[model samples]
Target: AQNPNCNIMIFHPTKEEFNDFDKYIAYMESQGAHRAGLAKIIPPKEWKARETYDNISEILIATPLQQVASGRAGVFTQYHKKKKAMTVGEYRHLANSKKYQTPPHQNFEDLERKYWKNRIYNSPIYGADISGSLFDENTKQWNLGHLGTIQDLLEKECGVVIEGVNTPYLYFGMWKTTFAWHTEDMDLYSINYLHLGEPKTWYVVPPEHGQRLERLARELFPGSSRGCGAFLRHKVALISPTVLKENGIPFNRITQEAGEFMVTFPYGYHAGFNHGFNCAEAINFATPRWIDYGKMASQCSCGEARVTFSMDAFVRILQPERYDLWKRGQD
Candidate 1:
């Protein structure tokens, strides 16, 4: 049973919770952005397939996490167009049998090198979150109506663009397939829409305790880190809400159902698992406050080179448009 005192908030569109989108955005930023919330967006007519998720034929399964920290247990793409879709039972069986192997490696460094070298479209997962022509054009036909309020302005004026980051990516998950603890790229905010699925459980830690959590993580999973400090390649152990609370670290537990959006804030560490087969779409966004955090994330000792939308360049380009907003005490 879920604790009533859990930190996660559930928002309903029928209420006024979403009437002031910008206000809610700022409120989330003020609250350390790690607070997870849920919302619903009416899908486009053409996107009705999302209700059942029969349109998607291929999926990328995350390999077992037993040795994930050593750069093993990455995602593997599976195409099912010519055959029946894989059931969750089969996936679990293969994962437990260690059927998947890491790309050939001489050492951890070699494994890490091969990890990046073998990126399919520079992404960890390829199928569900894969970007294509759907988001490339300007048509709002496929856009989610409730979340589209600021989409126009964010695209036109701010000029804040992330090539592969902005586009909405789909995810198909089954039991035991999990996303490890991590923050979004450059500490940006992410919104995940669960189109259809069994509830996906989320664990979130606020930014204030993120460092402490990381330090404790290092002590507990010393072998996970190759260099000093938490990095991009660290595969973390599953920490429950009970464990976080026992350690005096504040965290939120959110079990998201269909028709809900899970919003993760900047620098908020989070991880989750799919209860069963489900479909979801996630995308990243930036507010003016994201600039500094993005810069810091780029310089973090994550071993891997960081990629981000150039804050300096974007500011220079939008100076005229942003100046008035700044004077009005808004950005």
Candidate 2:
């Protein structure tokens, strides 16, 4: 199987083009760049972002990436929740700790054996308050008001807030800290900006072939996928490019550096990891077309206990604008 040490499509746009969300939509709808599952755009040269990573005293839920060397040493199965709550400052210290700084173990075997299991990956800070960062509320680039122009039926049309659906999440990453294969919640498009630090590598299969990827993943991890139709949401599997190649699924590879924007299309499946210490922010936003996908979302796939943000409510909010657009299209 020939691995695509694969490459990605990138957009180089001027500041004027980058600033206009209308043109951004027009360009992407016809540009077909997202056919690759995701695309990267270089932010205007003047863009700069800052965060208080060194001073974040908030308790961050950190998870350990435990790699056992028997069947597959690199296939890290995350605990995925709780028990390892650490401060952002504490995780930075542990992630930045020297490799040779051995813990108090009498034998080298015990030290090296135990140390490999203790790599702390900071859990994604979903819905972190906007005020906690140094980001300006006025900037259009990182502002939540601008991602895919925000599915703002509630805020603008209905004059209300759908906090969970509208919020952004902060992610703290270190070397090999990975987010596994998955589509965005409710099949919406997602945008991720590298706030600071080292490059992150991404792996994305073709949008048309996402079903194939899901099939292969289910075949490989039956235990995890059992009875869960959209098991990729679990964040437990890491399938390599070689595996994809062997299965005949086309994929793309991309690298995102600081001050860049990475976007996934509606129903896009993507996975990525940090090169070193890096901080990123990602938020999901709906397109006008997501209304159809939202309606078609399979019923009770995960469980009754799992609830998604309301599409019916969103649809209720959009009828006026949709009718206006429909009438305008006829003219």
Candidate 3:
């Protein structure tokens, strides 16, 4: 219910039955097309096997996975951004027909890694270069034309949004394990949907709740733990096997039925654990920009740096274009 206003309705669902294991496998394949090469078996914990499904979750959950702090690169495309804002139905038609071309440098994974290592790690955002440009790097990441569309479409389909900015983006391909528990950015409105092989375990929490989980060590249990659940200024949502209605007090919930997908908002907190070695396919959304609270810590020519865009900038630069696009969709 966070679109311009609290207008989104949510539902809770019950679990459904699978006809058989093969039928379930077929369903899994149909939903996760991106992970064609992942193994059917779950991997051993922290075990470093070259199996495709192993470490898939760890690649996203671990801080080190995103720790490729040097030579990062970004892409930009105005046409792609416009296409994404047009509407999901419109975009889906194109996607179904595979009408869009791979944006320029879409496959420049090497280029991106190099740039990420250089700019992100060497910048003021992390105390490397005080005068270096985190803002510029973040701006570049946020405005990538090729990536913006994918981010938007993923949000439209899945409530979860994963961000791999200034980092190598959870090196599941290398680590070959599952992800630890972490709500992206500590916000309550987001979740991670790990696409692992052969029906893996998924975790979740509703928003305005799960306060028992501290900012860091989100220990869901009393014993040794790594923390779990949502944090402040965000809601909770997830793709659970069962449809659970009635969120715990002070929290909101989003439901994910067996076949239906649910998206945790950008502000939602979540984590994923993939126990298999296989290629995974997850389609989620996120803003393409990097934000440095420290850079915005001091004053600038315009004024003191703040958490978000200046009002003048948002009003004059962003609002008009956003309004026009929104109007077109409503019409």
Candidate 4:
């Protein structure tokens, strides 16, 4: 019971996608002569987890979006150690739900713990501030603009512009974590790339042709981004994109192991699974545009609070016309 003309294709990244990490690091070293050219060489985990403000700022700037954006498919390799992980019940009890709250960048162990499954040592260079604001407190979220710098580089270098609530930079990492089903304020494009460690499943459903993706979403989800397997008005069914046994054409086909993917915006219906097991992975989305907020509000209910924090504040400040589309696309 499937449509015959859905145009979905799947493929792996060619060598060009990963060849930049080494070359770019070398370039950074050459630029600074007196410092002995990249003397520290901090591990990715430490670089991200270091408590010192200077260390965090230094690392962020030294390897700004400019350095990693072009390496769209580079994998920051690491030794994954998960000999004794906790069960879902244990994790739920051990982890604080408040950790999901944000102001990203401020010290919040809860956010770090919640993101544990994300195995973030290898996360994208950007989007790491679980405090979650693109800009700091002094500046309003709306005052800050598009993540264009990264987007431009991706289009110029990677040849594809991904879609997502936020344009996540191409600097990807490895982790065996699960993500809830959610949409950004705008249309998005992204690929959930898997590598090493655990295996998880991505659940998905194609958008109903000519239907408002949000209305269908509310009827099914009722009040959350992670809604699963619900029927629409006794007529529509939710589905995940899977690689067909026959000729696997188109870019969105789901296949076992690592590959690329794209998230449709406004009303694109898709979600994922952990396959009931821990998994390692990376997702790459372009950065030119930002997420649409109207789509983010779940029937007047902020499901998953995807629109909370920095984004919520961003909309609060935008002038009526300056770029109102950020939250209007969902309507």
Candidate 5:
């Protein structure tokens, strides 16, 4: 009984059952999936995944990854100073090497030195913005840009397509590669599909507990908290899930695997790590209901480039849906 709520009700949607995106999401929310800050879908094994990019490169990246410290997972930005880089093929071979699997960093100094030597075991390729190049710039069963999908609504009226929001992006990670605790850009609902990869371990706090998480963040990271909500996007405000439970905030653990999908609802705070060498794709979406949450996000001067998508601007374009949403959230 490590976590009574660990089982965030999962939906086993067959290939045909998930044809409509918003409808399924509405169904998921109707079943009270929002309380978990995350929802799960184990698509039928028979569903054939479509072909996407064959590589993760041309746009090479070097990230300073965090190592587990004193029982706390490394917050990539706060804990790491040194970053290492390698090609996709090079990193894949390195993952296979015995030395790469076990990085012996006694403390921060040892960890810092390894990156300089071009040898960091926990190197990860995070957020390579694939935007329009991969996975249906042209094509969901897994089509994020498919007509009629909630994500595509942004493009239905908006001027330019927002990468990783209106479209999908790629992530390449190795063992214990962590994504710090944060909500999606614009606090929009997001969907992640593990096209092919090692299982990713996720931790989420309910949107209801989001305020408590913010309070704890202020207590622990006062300087960053001063930046307002923008700080959470910094990839530096990470606290272990165990630490969360200790502080009276609730969380649930998820082991997302290949071929499965995960949904983080509007304002849902989520974070996780990769189990091994794997690639996953994620993109954001929103429904008419999301306008309410989008409007509440704080505007700031933290120089932290926040999401540029304007909810009011989009809502104003459609009078029919606008009136209905306005009337409902009015109460």
Candidate 6:
């Protein structure tokens, strides 16, 4: 009841009601879309928990995955200044398999296991680009849907060619893996499908409430704006719904289950945590409507600004394509 237009939207669609999925994908790319919601669809045969784990383990055994060390500090608390990179196996062993011997090692283990339920192991150079990778399935799905073509056509028209602008990435989240508050790249749209996992609790701030939340955040942490980097870091601060409601900002929640698709809108801020061990596939995409924001985000000197303008763009390309795709009886 708090927000009617341009707020987070939730959808519950069945195979029969889904109408080939693209229709729903198109809606997610539209302006009226919300920050996050749930959509039920037939899970990919490869996305089952065991299947996902097997696929990932097999691929990583052949090619080491890239792991970024974000520290054991919870997103709401202070983060360790030192960040490092390790292999997926190294991270997994350190997080889940190690035995603490030294005091420092024991402390590190305790904190990591306590706060950071899961850590990120991103693909290097579009891991899916490698054949037989877990991401290959999602990659093919996007290919058949012609999303890459749209992005390319737009970028070609704009005279930009940013590689990996909207590539798909795979994630393995253990219990309590936290993503702090943030929007999508260049305020663009993002889609995340929990290939298989326990429920994920999402807290989303509507686009209209963005500035208000920002103001409240600044008030809560007076020194937050002193430096751009201080504000841009994912570890900067945590704004929970309880915190938001205390400050009078209304937010939405979505409990994302396995086999459900969650879509976030352009510029919609969101953060969440996995209830337990899970695997998810996520990708970023843009539509014609995102041009203005894309241009601004790409051109901005902000610390969080992306290399979007350095990529490419186009215009007057969405309607005809969408109408045809949205039309009934169309694939």
**lDDT of each prediction vs. the true structure?**
0.48, 0.58, 0.25, 0.29, 0.62, 0.48
Which should have the higher TM-score, number 2 or number 3?
2
lDDT by residue for model 3 (34-139), tens: 1211212222233221234322222222111221221112211001011112222332233223222122233334322332233232211000101111112322
Estimate TM-scores for all models: 0.58, 0.71, 0.26, 0.35, 0.72, 0.62
lDDT of 2 by residue, 1-331 (tens): 1112324567777777867654675486566766777888886777555434444546463553332122243344444433355666665555566641234555533432342344333232211223223345667655543454344633554365654345666666665465667777556778788877767778787666778888888788777667666667655567766567778877877778888888887667898666555667777676555656554443223442233354434433444334343233223
Candidate topping TM-score: 5
lDDT of 6 by residue, 126-210 (tens): 0222222234444434332224543663565565554433445566554445566777655666667676546567777776677
Off by over 4 Å in 3: 1-146, 149-176, 186-196, 215-262, 281-284, 287-331
Candidate 1 stretches with Cα past 4 Å from truth are 1-6, 15-24, 27-54, 58-128, 132-165, 232-237, 298-331
Scanning candidate 5 in windows of ten residues, the lowest lDDT window is: 68-77
Superposition TM-score, candidate 4 onto the true structure:
0.35
- Give the candidates in order of TM-score, highest first: 5, 2, 6, 1, 4, 3
For candidate 1, the per-residue lDDT at 256 reads 75
Model 1 C-alpha lDDT per residue in residues 1-331, reported as the tens digit of each score = 2322335554433334444555666765454333432222333233332334444444433332222223323322211222234433454343334333233446444433343334222221112333322222333233333344223434554565422224566665544445666787556677777766555677777665677667656654555454534453233455544456667766766567776667776777887665545667777766666555654652223434233343333333345444343233312
| List of clashing residue pairs for candidate 6 | 8-34, 154-313, 155-312, 155-313, 158-313, 160-311, 160-312, 161-311, 162-311
- Angstrom error of the Cα, residue 118, model 3: value is 41
lDDT of 6: 0.48
Deviation in Å, model 2, residue 92 alpha carbon: 1.8
- Residues 20-41, candidate 5, lDDT per residue (tens digit)? 7678888777778877889888
